[PDB]
Design a protein around this ligand. Structure first.
Ligand code: J7W
Ligand code: J7W
Ligand code: UDP
Ligand code: UDP
Ligand code: NA
Ligand code: NA
Lengths: 230, 230
């Protein structure tokens, strides 16, 4: 019938990729849209482009943040629409789990880059204008959000575990900042956004500080009860 | 009924703004979409943004070309869709004259900036990918193109006439380059583009080297005969 759209949100290395790759397996009605940024740091023209801009961001984030964020968000919309138009056509209760959303792109990452002075006012205002417009022009509007909530310390341990060379320099302070934005947006709900419906949108919060790779039935029970109310 | 969409194309200072402001007056069925870049170098957030990026382009085109071209093209699409959805609702034979198009943005300006090394390969490929996609996601597809063809020398005289301080340093060589791209795209038709229908799309070419401010009936006769065949 009509696909239910659920964003999975959380700090770096909270366990979102682990979680979605568990969910996709448990039902034929369940599919996953991986974060294009994750696929760039694994050959498509999008991957060469993303690979090039990720690398240039390490050298000069104040040069490449605007270019990165716009291309990261474009790539997510096109990947979200491809899944929405290519899968779960003969599914009874189809659910599409997005690894993060257009809202994390803006109110977590792009916002953080503006606050770290990696975008100037003109770049941030062009970005927001582009984002408002790119999204208007109800299709990927979310039925619900699942917040995988983890302490910065757990996420720092899990970056160590994941063992990506590029990521081993991420400091606790950076994760503390991303953590703070997730708390304000999804838990305290103190964040003004420019998308009216988000304030209604149901949020399931899951504490994932404890390892769940081999012990996730309780999280899945809460997901199925969440899905039943939508 | 359904609005006919005609792009006016031509080098800087060929006379496109003069021409469209003549056409808009001759019929209630005739409307004009001015080039947003033209309105930035005349307060909306789009105008502050465009004003800021135009200024920064004079200092450092190799820093701002990507940002400029993407925002210039976004702004044109939104302005084209606003006219298409707000005017000529009770017009019998409605015609909408676009001052330039999404195709001039790409195959004239962005392309020229890439060739002048103001965009690197990653910026040019991101731009083209964005452009392909932004346009797909038949609405602003053109019924025809009117090429106001003028020599670089006429355009250089007309920049002098227009008397914008910012423009008085434009050299003949730059206009010769833009002229060459217009000839290849619209006259010789030697330019491959990534939009299949453009190769069919009818082109009216008008020699506008002679002043027409007070003597434009012949040009308008050719426009009305052109419109009749579409
Ligand atoms: C790959 C990479 C490389 C480098 C940096 N760098 C910085 O974040 C950074 C900022 C500031 C500073 C200090 N500061 C001093 C002052 N100068 C002027 C200016 C720099 C130093 C470093 C970040 C990344 N990763 C990023 N991924 C995203 C992202 N990830 C998604 N999954 C989705 C999405 N939409 N966005 C956003 S950022
Ligand atoms: C306002 C402004 C300011 C500056 C420049 N500058 C250069 O074009 C320029 C390039 C190259 C050079 C030398 N080159 C040496 C080598 N370094 C590395 C790199 C620079 C020097 C200068 C152009 C403009 N105007 C522009 N308007 C458009 C445009 N106009 C529309 N109407 C629609 C649309 N889509 N685009 C495109 S460009
Ligand atoms: O309960 C968990 C969740 C995650 N991980 C590991 O933590 C790292 C980060 O998780 P993931 O890549 O899923 O994080 P994301 O960035 O996708 O949130 C990976 O090496 C996982 O295998 C783990 O050991 N136990
Ligand atoms: O037949 C003409 C056409 C144009 N102009 C002048 O040439 C300049 C450039 O024309 P316009 O601004 O229309 O050029 P565009 O950039 O819009 O092609 C302006 O000062 C016009 O008044 C003119 O004197 N005679
Ligand atoms: Na599945
Ligand atoms: Na009119």
């Amino acid at each position: 019938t009509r696909i239910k759209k659920i964003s999975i949100e959380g700090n770096i290395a909270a366990g979102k990729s682990t979680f979605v790759n568990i969910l996709k397996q448990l039902s034929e009605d369940w599919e996953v849209v991986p974060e294009p940024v994750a696929r760039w740091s694994n050959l498509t023209m999008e991957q060469k482009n993303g690979g090039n801009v990720l690398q240039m961001m390490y050298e000069k984030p104040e040069r490449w943040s605007f270019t990165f964020q716009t291309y990261a968000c474009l790539s997510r919309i096109r990947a979200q629409l491809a899944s929405l138009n290519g899968k779960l056509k003969d599914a009874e209760k189809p659910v599409l789990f997005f690894e993060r959303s257009v809202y994390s792109d803006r109110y977590i990452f792009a916002s953080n880059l503006y606050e770290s002075e990696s975008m100037n006012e003109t770049e941030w205002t062009i970005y927001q204008d582009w984002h408002d417009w790119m999204n208007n022009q109800q299709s990927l509007e979310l039925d619900g959000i699942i917040y995988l909530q983890a302490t910065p310390e757990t996420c720092l341990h899990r970056i160590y575990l994941r063992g990506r060379n590029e990521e081993q320099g991420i400091p606790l302070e950076y994760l503390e900042k991303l953590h703070y934005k997730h708390e304000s947006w999804l838990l305290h709900r103190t964040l003004k956004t420019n998308f009216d419906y988000l304030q209604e949108v149901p949020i399931l919060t899951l504490d994932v500080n404890e390892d769940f790779k081999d012990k996730y039935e309780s999280l899945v029970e809460k997901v199925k009860e969440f899905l039943s109310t939508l």
